[PDB]
Amino acid sequence: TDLARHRWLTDNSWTRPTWTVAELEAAKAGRTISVVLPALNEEETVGGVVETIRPLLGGLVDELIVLDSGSTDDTEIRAMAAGARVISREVALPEVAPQPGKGEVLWRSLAATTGDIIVFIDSDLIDPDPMFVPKLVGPLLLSEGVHLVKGFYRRPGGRVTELVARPLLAALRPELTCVLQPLGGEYAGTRELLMSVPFAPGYGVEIGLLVDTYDRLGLDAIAQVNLGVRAHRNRPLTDLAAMSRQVIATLFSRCGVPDSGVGLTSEVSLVDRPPMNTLRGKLAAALEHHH
Amino acid sequence: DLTATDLARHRWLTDNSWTRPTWTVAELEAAKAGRTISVVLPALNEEETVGGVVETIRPLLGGLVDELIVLDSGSTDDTEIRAMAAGARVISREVALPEVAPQPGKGEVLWRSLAATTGDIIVFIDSDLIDPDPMFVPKLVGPLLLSEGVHLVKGFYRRPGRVTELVARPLLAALRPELTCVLQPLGGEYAGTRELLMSVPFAPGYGVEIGLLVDTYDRLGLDAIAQVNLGVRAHRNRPLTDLAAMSRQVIATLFSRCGVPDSGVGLTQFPRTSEVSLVDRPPMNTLRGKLAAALEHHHHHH
Numbered sequence: 001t002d003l004a005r006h007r008w009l010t011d012n013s014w015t016r017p018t019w020t021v022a023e024l025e026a027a028k029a030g031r032t033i034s035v036v037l038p039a040l041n042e043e044e045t046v047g048g049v050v051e052t053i054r055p056l057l058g059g060l061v062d063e064l065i066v067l068d069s070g071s072t073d074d075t076e077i078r079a080m081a082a083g084a085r086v087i088s089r090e091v092a093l094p095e096v097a098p099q100p101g102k103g104e105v106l107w108r109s110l111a112a113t114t115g116d117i118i119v120f121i122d123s124d125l126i127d128p129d130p131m132f133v134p135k136l137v138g139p140l141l142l143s144e145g146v147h148l149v150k151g152f153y154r155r156p157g158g159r160v161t162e163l164v165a166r167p168l169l170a171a172l173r174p175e176l177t178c179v180l181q182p183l184g185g186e187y188a189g190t191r192e193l194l195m196s197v198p199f200a201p202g203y204g205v206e207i208g209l210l211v212d213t214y215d216r217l218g219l220d221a222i223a224q225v226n227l228g229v230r231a232h233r234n235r236p237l238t239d240l241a242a243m244s245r246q247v248i249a250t251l252f253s254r255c256g257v258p259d260s261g262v263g264l265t266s267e268v269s270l271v272d273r274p275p276m277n278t279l280r281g282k283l284a285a286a287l288e289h290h291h
Numbered sequence: 292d293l294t295a296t297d298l299a300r301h302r303w304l305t306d307n308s309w310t311r312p313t314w315t316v317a318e319l320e321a322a323k324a325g326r327t328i329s330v331v332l333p334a335l336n337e338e339e340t341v342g343g344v345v346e347t348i349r350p351l352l353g354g355l356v357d358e359l360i361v362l363d364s365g366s367t368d369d370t371e372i373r374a375m376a377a378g379a380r381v382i383s384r385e386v387a388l389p390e391v392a393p394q395p396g397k398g399e400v401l402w403r404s405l406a407a408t409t410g411d412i413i414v415f416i417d418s419d420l421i422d423p424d425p426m427f428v429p430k431l432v433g434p435l436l437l438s439e440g441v442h443l444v445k446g447f448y449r450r451p452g453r454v455t456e457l458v459a460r461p462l463l464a465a466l467r468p469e470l471t472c473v474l475q476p477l478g479g480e481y482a483g484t485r486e487l488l489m490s491v492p493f494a495p496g497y498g499v500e501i502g503l504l505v506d507t508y509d510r511l512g513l514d515a516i517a518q519v520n521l522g523v524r525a526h527r528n529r530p531l532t533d534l535a536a537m538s539r540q541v542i543a544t545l546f547s548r549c550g551v552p553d554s555g556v557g558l559t560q561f562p563r564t565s566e567v568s569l570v571d572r573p574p575m576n577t578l579r580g581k582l583a584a585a586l587e588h589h590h591h592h593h
């Protein structure tokens with residue numbers, strides 16, 4: 001089974017993406033690219049992240065959007081000043097009452113974008129690099145059959161990643177242990193995939209998308225690329241335990257394990273949002289390729 | 292609003308948890324009432340600390356404690372002779388249970404200790420402890436000697452670990468949420484009755500502690516489980532690869548008890564993946580003390 005993981009890494013993993021912006025533009029072939037940054041109270045970093053993507057707008061990148069998650073700091077004005085269009089959760093999907101968590105934000109962004117490719121980038125990154133978006137879309141534009149690209153960082157994984165996500169995947173979806181950073185916030189997906197799957201709530205959205213992509217489209221539909229060396233950032237153990245609890249709930253929900261829904265003495269939801277093509281059928285159909 | 296888990300936890304802490312388990316050794320001896328107490332130290336290459344742990348338990352020998360055994364797990368250092376000089380009885384896995392070939396891991400050692408001990412109550416203490424305290428054993432056996440219906444006591448430390456808070460407790464919250472009341476379910480210092488420990492299977496390696504906890508709960512509920520404060524101890528740092536291997540086996544063992552299939556695929560390292568290939572051992576009363584008084588489980592019918 002290590003031969004399967006080995007062949008995936010040789011074909012679907014890039015430690016040193018060579019691609020230039022110019023060759024990626026030339027390869028778009030009519031497809032459009034939307035970059036979405038979710039943001040809840042990220043005034044200190046959102047501008048910096050937007051600034052590294054902004055020079056691509058009008059070229060490789062067709063839309064640059066910050067999806068504000070109900071911030072009360074200066075996130076929106078700083079994201080605007082850095083050159084992003086700022087869209088609230090309510091504007092993205094007005095007739096559906098919002099609910100908390102990151103998964104909600106990413107899901108609503110599908111109704112407020114037009115890209116055939118959607119790129120997600122966390123807005124709390126303190127060291128964003130301008131080649132993030134090019135490296136994330138490279139496999140989608142130049143490799144047949146890829147629908148989800150996960151950006152990983154070399155270390156100079158994470159405690160939740162190595163103690164929770166990777167060992168649970170070994171137990172329940174063993175082929176997926178080849179994904180280095182399954183919980184990473186930087187990744188890109190096709191409209192065809194993202195429009196057609198449920199979105200898990202809160203901190204479960206990344207692992208839910210990975211497992212749903214694996215089941216529906218297969219291992220070769222997933223790729224991964226190295227975005228650069230980044231050290232781990234400190235997070236309190238209570239936040240990490242809360243994130244673990246929701247990663248567990250979403251994995252269990254995708255495998256049919258009855259999860260009690262009981263949190264840690266912490267929020268945990270077992271309810272997905274439905275595929276966006278059920279609420280935006282005409283948008284979704286308009287975005288389906290003729291062939 | 293308080294949940295059903297919150298309510299059970301609060302009352303369980305009132306009745307079954309002791310932050311200051313101040314029983315005297317004399318009153319615990321007086322309460323033994325013919326029952327005997329075996330203390331078991333599993334040991335795999337702990338030459339630097341095993342003697343110090345034994346030294347703290349030794350003054351109880353002949354009174355509260357009836358036997359003190361280091362069950363050696365195949366050490367190649369000076370673990371055994373240092374345990375001997377410190378005043379313990381050293382028994383190998385092989386001598387403990389000659390008719391079964393050993394397999395590696397901590398669970399095997401504790402399971403085998405049941406055949407090598409005679410106490411009505413068996414106490415487990417890790418042999419790698421840096422700062423063992425002489426009141427560990429009194430505090431662990433208190434609720435077994437004085438509290439009706441208690442069969443398993445988990446000792447915890449106040450802090451001045453990642454697998455417990457990121458793996459064990461979140462998974463218990465999902466699969467057995469009442470058990471999230473236990474502060475340190477993976478702790479190595481704990482005690483149980485012979486009638487309980489002989490009746491349950493033992494999980495291998497790093498899964499033995501969590502397996503005993505869930506097996507006890509599934510048979511007897513929260514009422515049979517207690518916990519006691521052993522004192523203040525700082526977290527000792529372990530390599531990340533060790534923690535990941537521990538996590539993988541805790542997951543395996545929890546899954547087998549809660550009706551979740553498990554791939555048997557160990558952990559992938561970078562491109563190489565191991566195979567969880569160690570088996571649960573059956574209840575020791577299938578090999579020893581076969582006609583002993585069985586453990587009455589909770590009836591699920593009426």
Ligand SMILES: O=c1ccn([C@@H]2O[C@H](COP(=O)(O)O)[C@@H](O)[C@H]2O)c(=O)[nH]1
Nearest residue numbers: 038039040042069101102105122123124
């Ligand atoms: O409810 C939420 C949680 C996080 N987020 C954003 O998602 C990103 C990841 O959040 P995190 O670092 O707390 O895990 C970060 O950019 C947050 O600002 C939201 O937009 N809404």
Ligand SMILES: O=c1ccn([C@@H]2O[C@H](COP(=O)(O)O)[C@@H](O)[C@H]2O)c(=O)[nH]1
Nearest residue numbers: 333334335364395396397400417418419
């Ligand atoms: O195979 C094993 C593993 C650990 N042990 C002992 O169990 C205790 C807990 O081990 P640990 O801290 O490596 O998880 C410690 O005292 C070890 O010496 C064994 O006796 N056998």
Ligand SMILES: [Cl-]
Nearest residue numbers: 452453454455
């Ligand atoms: Cl721990």
Ligand SMILES: [Mg+2]
Nearest residue numbers: 040041042124
């Ligand atoms: Mg933040």
Ligand SMILES: [Mg+2]
Nearest residue numbers: 122124125185
């Ligand atoms: Mg973050």
Ligand SMILES: [Mg+2]
Nearest residue numbers: 335336337419
């Ligand atoms: Mg050791």
Ligand SMILES: [Mg+2]
Nearest residue numbers: 417419420479
């Ligand atoms: Mg230890």
